[PDB]
Amino acid sequence: ADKAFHTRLINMRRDLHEHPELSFQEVETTKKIRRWLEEEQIEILDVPQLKTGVIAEIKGREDGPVIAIRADIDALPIQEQTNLPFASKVDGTMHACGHDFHTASIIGTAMLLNQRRAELKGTVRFIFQPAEEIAAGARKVLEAGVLNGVSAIFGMHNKPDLPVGTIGVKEGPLMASVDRFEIVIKGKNSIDPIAAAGQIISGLQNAVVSITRVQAGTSWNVIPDQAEMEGTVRTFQKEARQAVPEHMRRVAEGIAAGYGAQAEFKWFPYLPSVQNDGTFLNAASEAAARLGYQTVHAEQSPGGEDFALYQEKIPGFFVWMGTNGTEEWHHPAFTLDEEALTVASQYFAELAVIVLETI
Amino acid sequence: DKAFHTRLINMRRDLHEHPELSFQEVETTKKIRRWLEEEQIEILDVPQLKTGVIAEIKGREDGPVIAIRADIDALPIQEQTNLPFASKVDGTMHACGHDFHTASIIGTAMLLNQRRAELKGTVRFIFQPAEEIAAGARKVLEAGVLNGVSAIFGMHNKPDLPVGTIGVKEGPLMASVDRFEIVIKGKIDPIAAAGQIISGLQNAVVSITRVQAGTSWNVIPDQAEMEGTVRTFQKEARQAVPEHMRRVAEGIAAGYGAQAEFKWFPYLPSVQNDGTFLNAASEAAARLGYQTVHAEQSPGGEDFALYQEKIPGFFVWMGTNGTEEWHHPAFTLDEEALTVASQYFAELAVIVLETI
Ligand code: NI
Ligand code: NI
Ligand code: NI
Ligand code: NI
Incomplete structure (x- = not known):
């Protein structure tokens, strides 16, 4: 056979x-x-x-x-x-x-x-x-x-x-962990969530942070109240996977506060x-x-x-x-x-x- | 009376x-x-x-x-x-x-x-x-x-x-108002280029009011786009600012191996x-x-x-x-x-x- x-x-x-x-x-x-x-x-x-x-x-x-x-x-x-x-x-x-x-x-x-x-x-x-x-x-x-x-x-x-x-x-x-994250940037000069969002992109993006979606506003004239972004984190070690969300949170929270705004960080294990x-x-x-x-x-x-x-x-x-x-x-x-x-x-x-x- | x-x-x-x-x-x-x-x-x-x-x-x-x-x-x-x-x-x-x-x-x-x-x-x-x-x-x-x-x-x-x-x-007395649109795309990270362009420009006042990139949390985005307003008080500053914004946008986009298309709309x-x-x-x-x-x-x-x-x-x-x-x-x-x-x-x- x-x-x-x-x-x-x-x-x-x-x-x-x-x-x-x-x-x-x-x-x-x-x-x-x-x-x-x-x-x-x-x-x-x-x-x-x-x-x-x-x-x-x-x-x-x-x-x-x-x-x-x-x-x-x-x-x-x-x-x-x-x-x-x-x-x-x-x-x-x-x-x-x-x-x-x-x-x-x-x-x-x-x-x-x-x-x-x-x-x-x-x-x-x-x-x-x-x-x-x-x-x-x-x-x-x-x-x-x-x-x-x-x-x-x-x-x-x-x-x-x-x-x-x-x-x-x-x-x-052998193969990376995959995890989803979402960050919402909103207020509390009326507010600048976009400028906050821009710096956070540059701040975030051993682990690989990949931002895949960014959505803020609807019209060219109106100042947006919110900015949202989402993406994935990929790590190879267990501790790195447990340490990166907090590091990403700290970065997002700090930058947003600089602009008179606040950050919401959400983490979704995949x-x-x-x-x-x-x-x-x-x-x-x-x-x-x-x-x-x-x-x-x-x-x-x-x-x-x-x-x-x-x-x-x-x-x-x-x-x-x-x-x-x-x-x-x-x-x-x-x-x-x-x-x-x-x-x-x-x-x-x-x-x-x-x-x-x-x- | x-x-x-x-x-x-x-x-x-x-x-x-x-x-x-x-x-x-x-x-x-x-x-x-x-x-x-x-x-x-x-x-x-x-x-x-x-x-x-x-x-x-x-x-x-x-x-x-x-x-x-x-x-x-x-x-x-x-x-x-x-x-x-x-x-x-x-x-x-x-x-x-x-x-x-x-x-x-x-x-x-x-x-x-x-x-x-x-x-x-x-x-x-x-x-x-x-x-x-x-x-x-x-x-x-x-x-x-x-x-x-x-x-x-x-x-x-x-x-x-x-x-x-x-x-x-x-x-x-009152500011001029102008509309602009930027599209970041492959000739490659459009989001990183976009985040850098926002920081690179947000007497003239530039206000990014609209940002769109990607669709799903898994899919890597092919392009990013921005919309906003420009407000100036002098006639020369109104003409000079879009050329300046085009330089920064395309500069940064080339840094990330991308392309920036800049559209201008006078209001x-x-x-x-x-x-x-x-x-x-x-x-x-x-x-x-x-x-x-x-x-x-x-x-x-x-x-x-x-x-x-x-x-x-x-x-x-x-x-x-x-x-x-x-x-x-x-x-x-x-x-x-x-x-x-x-x-x-x-x-x-x-x-x-x-x-x-
Ligand atoms: Ni497969
Ligand atoms: Ni398979
Ligand atoms: Ni009116
Ligand atoms: Ni009126």
Whole structure:
């Protein structure tokens, strides 16, 4: 089962890529995943609270710890521009982030581990998670009790800039925290909230502050009472994430007071940083070594992944999967080399066996 | 006499009771027409002016023609005075004292009507619509009402000044008003450029009144845009400031690898009082026992300025012993100033026509 198994992985990837679904709307995707696992008699867990998304489980022949392997299943509201034979048949929707690839790979992993139950010193729970793109699915999975009793969680993201056969590996911070902020500048010379707003932009913009919206006034003649701005903060360390809002507040409050105005600062947490546990570092390396694949030191990503929400609760490891792509995530012409389907399915199957040996 | 003062008060109050917005001064137009026609004062036929009244009083000797102007439009503001003659139209009031300007100048006309032998030339009366939107003075000019007019005079009530006091000065009285628009875009951080441009410009006064950038808290913005006003007092400073603002805007924008497009929209020039009438303005107060003070400048704009770029003109402050500033819902006015203003402009016309 070499070429036959690979073609089976390719065909699943392409079926999903051809029929992409948006966050929380993955009805058919959920249906296909369920069917594909039941084909190989892999137990599917009953989680009625998850309308979309699939939870599966493979038990070893010994009692042991439970670990989890996660794939994301949702696509994006973007028109595909690849001109591939299996391109989205749904105009304006596309798997432009390779989640079709993640899904097919982890189904592969389940299929390989299904024939290797005697090697498993415990249980692997498979998580096919909806709504990664809106950072809402991981929270739904957690609240469904899917991670109760789970010791460790593992995941991947395709990395177009890395070659096939290469897995990106680092301990600690991999992907940035994402947080929303809003500042309203109003009075108490009538008032100058605009001048205040201008200095605060220059004052605010280890963390990266990105102001994305500024709105003050309606007409050229009338002096505005308010000025509002909003944006995101991105950090890599936990303390930086806890120290920047107060620093941003102090700056906004001080500048505004200089102009006879007052500042309202609002903070809305979105995502913690993807933080990799160093206890799995050795396992992540030896899994690639056993299969003759390569590892590189993972470069950090400015993006946020809701996989980080899992890692707030239990130890976890998230890796880059080299896919030799042409465009970055979310591009209309985004591609991936399907040879990585063998790499990724085998990698997580071997990682699961290795982790359960030592965990 | 009390009867004539009662008459001006009643016209003031009737217009106050029924205020009309810019270019909607239909009822106001007809009342002014009637009131002048009851005194056999000639109304000139100007078909193109739908609202507004042009009137004329000829002296008994041929000579120059001068104009005396009042504005007639009100504002979309709810009256909070609680006066018996408060606006009957909810959400509209004479919060800028244009009812007073109108009643006073009708007074001036009614006085000068009985002084035809003293007038060495002609006086034309302009009851101008749409002052508040700076559109009426241009319409008056386009209708040829100032063809052959040598000088123009006007007033505005000044609540801070006492009754019997006229605010007089040569040169710039009120600021010019100009509109500008800046767009910051890629040839790259538009917001940082925008924040820096705001700081880089917010005798001229620049007021950014409008800022827009981005749509959603996730999406990186492609462009930022600003709108605002520029106010100047000198003619050279009005021309130099947009070139200066363009340099700062494009400079900073290039710093952040962006582009700044600067658009300019002229609204009003400054009110510039011709010095040749300074003496006449002082003499008219003196002969009547009224006081003059050196007029303090105003940040606001008046479309009377448009007349002044065509012909020599003089705009004065009329003391009205008020409490609240122009445009305030509780804006008031001391009616005894109707005697002062109507008499002042009668005498000024007689003095101007013999000295110009
Ligand atoms: Ni994505
Ligand atoms: Ni993704
Ligand atoms: Ni006004
Ligand atoms: Ni006014």
